[PDB]
Amino acid sequence: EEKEILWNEAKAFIAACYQELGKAAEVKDRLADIKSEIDLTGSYVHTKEELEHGAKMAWRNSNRCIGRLFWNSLNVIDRRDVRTKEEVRDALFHHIETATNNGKIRPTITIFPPEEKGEKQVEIWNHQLIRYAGYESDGERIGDPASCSLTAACEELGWRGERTDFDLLPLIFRMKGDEQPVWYELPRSLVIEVPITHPDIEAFSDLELKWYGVPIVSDMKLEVGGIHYNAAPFNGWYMGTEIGARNLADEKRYDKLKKVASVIGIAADYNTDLWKDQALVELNKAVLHSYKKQGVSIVDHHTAASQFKRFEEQAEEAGRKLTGDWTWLIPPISPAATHIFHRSYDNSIVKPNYFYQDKPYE
Amino acid sequence: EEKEILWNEAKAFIAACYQELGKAAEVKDRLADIKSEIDLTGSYVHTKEELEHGAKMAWRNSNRCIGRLFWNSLNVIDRRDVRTKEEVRDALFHHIETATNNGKIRPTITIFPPEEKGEKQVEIWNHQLIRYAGYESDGERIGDPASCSLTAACEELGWRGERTDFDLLPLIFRMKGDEQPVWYELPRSLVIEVPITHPDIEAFSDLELKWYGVPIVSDMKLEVGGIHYNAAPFNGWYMGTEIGARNLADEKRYDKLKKVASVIGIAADYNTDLWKDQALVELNKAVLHSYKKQGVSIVDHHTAASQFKRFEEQAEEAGRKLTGDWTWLIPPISPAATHIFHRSYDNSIVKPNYFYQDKPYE
Ligand code: HEM
Ligand code: HEM
Ligand SMILES: CNCc1cccc(OCc2ccc3ccc(N)nc3c2)c1
Ligand SMILES: CNCc1cccc(OCc2ccc3ccc(N)nc3c2)c1
Ligand SMILES: C[C@H](O)[C@H](O)[C@H]1CNc2nc(N)[nH]c(=O)c2N1
Ligand SMILES: C[C@H](O)[C@H](O)[C@H]1CNc2nc(N)[nH]c(=O)c2N1
Ligand SMILES: [Cl-]
Ligand SMILES: [Cl-]
Known part of the structure; x- marks a missing residue:
């Protein structure tokens, strides 16, 4: 019917x-x-x-x-036209390479x-093609907590992370007719990473923060x-706030605000000091500065x-x-300074469009 | 019926x-x-x-x-029990005095x-009992633009502002049976004002910013x-962001960000510098610092x-x-640093409640 x-x-x-x-x-x-x-x-x-x-x-x-x-x-x-897991792998590799474009992101x-x-021909498990693993054993928290369940699923399949805070997850996807997905380690030569430094504060590098160049959403x-x-x-390319105000800042993610406040030399003791806000701004300045310095595309939330x-x-x-x-x-940093904040928007769904789908892990 | x-x-x-x-x-x-x-x-x-x-x-x-x-x-x-405009005036005066409570706001x-x-006994024209007038003649913009229409209505009734950026509007309200409202100048002894200084940056006072102590919403x-x-x-008492991120920051209000950036000594030339964000944070720190220093109640958005x-x-x-x-x-400054941002809320209307009503001017 x-x-x-x-x-x-x-x-x-x-x-x-x-x-x-x-x-x-x-x-x-x-x-x-x-x-x-x-x-x-x-x-x-x-x-x-x-x-x-x-x-x-x-x-x-x-x-x-x-x-x-x-x-x-x-x-x-x-x-x-792809029919094999080698072809799917190579298509994913090519996408990373072509989208990255030596930093000038397409x-x-x-x-x-x-x-x-309703039967899938190919089922990609990654949330993004490039993302960091996350671990949580007894007390110990390593990497990106948002990645904990997928990381555990990969380690079920024979992959093992080095357990740094920035382990690249392998590509992991399943082919129709296969009972289990396969996984392939990313060639590090394909993945651009950006060390986070600050334009004015030299101590900022002591945090040893980095992030990947290209967010490639692979589960919608x-x-x-x-x-x-x-x-x-x-x-696309990143808007800086996604990295600096969420991925690196959220308590359930990398949770770096208190460490940022220390290296920028302000107390993190009183709410009325707005130390979180000050930290967010310096962190977000650093992220834009770093990407720009490395010649990797990025947009700030005002320009965006x-x-x-x-x-x-x-x-x-x-x-x-x-x-x-x-x-x-609205951006998560100074939303009222954008025109978006001051108008409303019809949230109707129009097709064609991108949609959420259930995770095969979890 | x-x-x-x-x-x-x-x-x-x-x-x-x-x-x-x-x-x-x-x-x-x-x-x-x-x-x-x-x-x-x-x-x-x-x-x-x-x-x-x-x-x-x-x-x-x-x-x-x-x-x-x-x-x-x-x-x-x-x-x-009030029946006369003298009683209404005196009730409004008392409210200002008692709510203010020498700075410890009740x-x-x-x-x-x-x-x-459906007939009103008393109709208050003020949006807040204490607010600044706004003017806009040929090219010239003085005071609070949000107050332009009410300011013009007051000047129709024989009131005249000094045309500073912080003229206090008179109380203006109409009694049942009266065709026109009456207006009364606020006794300056009743109105606490707070000069905005910065904890660290002495030049901040060059901006000559101030704001009133108590927001008393009078038109709902x-x-x-x-x-x-x-x-x-x-x-209630103010949350700092209302003053520092909106009243003083909005382009359609006092629009002070570019001036803030100058006194704090950063360029206001490039979006990627996040100079608006940095300005917002310093301005908001100043507002909290000033109110606290003067012993006037205020809350920061994190504590709130x-x-x-x-x-x-x-x-x-x-x-x-x-x-x-x-x-x-969500606050207009660092909303993602509050728990509010990360959950959702049922926006149903439950009574008893406060509602908007049409303005008698405009
Ligand atoms: C070119 C640069 C681009 C920028 C700067 C950009 C910016 C953003 C941002 C900031 C978000 C919010 C993400 C979040 O808060 O988690 C977003 C959401 C989204 N973007 Fe874009 N984007 C870009 C390109 C694209 C492209 C190429 C597509 C698809 C063809 C796309 C589709 C979406 C979708 C579907 C969402 C919502 C995802 C969800 O519901 O979780 N964007 N974008
Ligand atoms: C005690 C300290 C209080 C604080 C810090 C506070 C904080 C706030 C803030 C920040 C807003 C948003 C205003 C805006 O964005 O324009 C708000 C809205 C509101 N507050 Fe409160 N509030 C307080 C007390 C009160 C009291 C005593 C009442 C009434 C009895 C009240 C009723 C409301 C109403 C009705 C709104 C919405 C107004 C509208 O729709 O425009 N609040 N409050
Ligand atoms: C885990 N957060 C929920 C969730 C689930 C599935 C997809 C998704 O994508 C967000 C998203 C999607 C597309 C983007 C494109 C460019 C960009 N800079 N960010 C982007 C961010 C977010
Ligand atoms: C002009 N903005 C729209 C509009 C129309 C009518 C009332 C109103 O009030 C906002 C409002 C209401 C109550 C408050 C109580 C305390 C507080 N700090 N701010 C408060 C702010 C806002
Ligand atoms: C209606 C439109 O969304 C507009 O931005 C609203 C909503 N967000 C707001 N939030 C606050 N705190 N104050 C406001 O005046 C508004 N305006
Ligand atoms: C569902 C809930 O409102 C939650 O805060 C949502 C909405 N706001 C957001 N906005 C952005 N940019 N990213 C997010 O992940 C979320 N989460
Ligand atoms: Cl991301
Ligand atoms: Cl206000």
Whole structure:
């Protein structure tokens, strides 16, 4: 019966997509072919053009994303042809290499074969292709706590971390028909890392903080015209606050504020001193300074908000409703200094889009 | 017909109120009397006990308020007896004096006669009893822009501001049957002001910033058991960010960030320098430091969030649903460093409560 759901989502997408591509006349025939294909086969296949535009539309419709101004320049890599775990591995490696681009990050998505009967062809376990492991035995806390469950799942499969605070997790994914996923260590030559130093405070390096260059989100499902691409990792470049105000600052993450306060030479004893706030700002300055110094792309939250304002304006000129999630759009540092804070946003879900899916570990 | 709306709201309130007061048995008879009073007169009158508890419940139910831990210690001044503008004026003066308490601020509400037929007995035009005027003629911007419309309305009525950046607006309110409101200049002896200095940076005083001690919100309607108290000004003490991150920082308010950056000696040229963020933190440190130094009550956003966590815990122990507006509960400075940021809140409206009402100017 599900052909009905597939059919409607397809009608809606193909009409919108071809309309945007200036190919409004080619719809009826393309729709005919699709209608025919669904009946005969239960599914349908996107042309490279449709798939590329769909991934772009999905980014455009991501309510929680401040970086959407650049939706139309997304680099879409079509890998629906992969059949083996060696090919999947090599596609993931290539994505890291091409997206990184020696530091001048290209927003990229690699698209693997979609679900057929709801059955996945490829199931990626990583939350991001590049991320640090996390450990928690008796009392001892090492690495990134957000990574504890995946780290434990990897160690079940024969991987073993060095237990530094910045162990790179291996790529881990499962192929249809395989009962267990496989894992592959990342070639360190592929992964750019940035040591965190401060522009003015030389002691900042005593913290020995670092972070990876490219956030490549690998556990969300891309949905385009009723077709479910559960494996489709994508990346942009970082907004500094993600690293400096969350990954490094959150108590349930690296929890570094008290250490930052020490090296910048302020007391961490009184709330009224705003020592957490001062620490957040210096930490966030350091992160932007370091990435810039190393020639790795990054955006600050003010510039990012200015760009998003241009996205709003562009949406309006094009006659498209704007949707957004205010609670995710505001940055976690000085939100009221951005225009985002002072307006509201319609949080409706429009497709094509990216969605959460259940973790196979946990 | 409206007696029906009044009756239900009354049943709901009296049951909840007396239940909380340990007087659950006295409900049936109190309800009987009320039912009788509504039929005979169209309305009913709160006992001092009911009114006091209702105002407290209203504060408890204010989704946007982070300061709710202290709901039960609200100082309720019952002024339903006032009939003249001299009495209203003197009640407003007294509120300022008693709430201020030489700097050790008492959360206070003064309650004036409620609406009868929807007809107001007293209509207060001030947004806060103490606030600064704002002006905008050709090019020239003086004072608080948020006050422009009320300032213009006052100047229509014969008041004239000195046009400093911190002119105190007069009290302005209208009595039933009067066509125009009256206005009275505030005795400067009643109004505590705090010069903003910085703990470490002596040049900060060159900005000549100041703010008033007590925010007394005077344009919201208190609703208790179907009874509409449109005139019921209330106050707490300030959370520093309200002054330092909004009143003084917002571009549409005093817009001081660029001037702050100059006196603290950092460039205001590059977004990646996070100069706005650094300025916000120093400005906010200054505000807390100044209030504390002068012996005027104030809370920082971290301590305030810790208190609100205790409010959540207390709500749970008492078996009361918690409601809140995340978008107003998070502070505008380092929101992710508070627990509030990392949870969600049911934004349902529960009565008794405080509500917006239309401005008579504008
Ligand atoms: C080009 C630079 C980009 C920047 C600076 C950027 C910035 C951000 C930020 C800061 C968030 C919030 C993340 C969080 O708070 O955890 C976000 C969310 C998101 N971004 Fe972007 N982004 C960029 C590119 C992209 C691209 C290329 C895509 C997909 C094609 C994308 C899709 C999303 C999605 C789906 C979310 C929400 C994820 C969720 O619900 O957890 N973004 N973005
Ligand atoms: C005791 C110290 C108090 C503190 C520190 C405090 C803190 C705050 C803050 C920071 C806000 C947000 C204001 C904004 O962003 O514009 C707020 C909102 C509010 N507070 Fe409180 N508050 C306190 C006492 C009170 C009292 C005594 C009442 C009433 C009896 C009250 C009722 C409210 C209401 C109704 C709002 C929302 C106003 C609106 O929707 O615009 N608060 N509070
Ligand atoms: C673990 N946090 C929840 C969760 C679950 C799944 C995906 C996700 O992604 C957040 C996200 C997604 C895309 C991004 C693109 C660029 C960027 N700089 N950050 C980005 C951050 C976040
Ligand atoms: C002009 N801003 C919108 C608007 C309209 C009407 C009332 C209001 O009040 C905000 C408010 C209310 C009560 C408060 C109590 C204590 C406090 N420190 N701030 C407080 C701030 C805000
Ligand atoms: C309506 C819009 O979301 C707007 O930014 C609101 C919400 N957030 C806020 N939060 C606070 N503390 N104060 C405000 O005035 C506002 N304004
Ligand atoms: C669900 C809850 O409101 C929680 O704080 C959310 C919303 N705000 C957020 N905003 C960002 N940027 N990132 C997050 O992970 C979250 N978490
Ligand atoms: Cl991240
Ligand atoms: Cl205020």
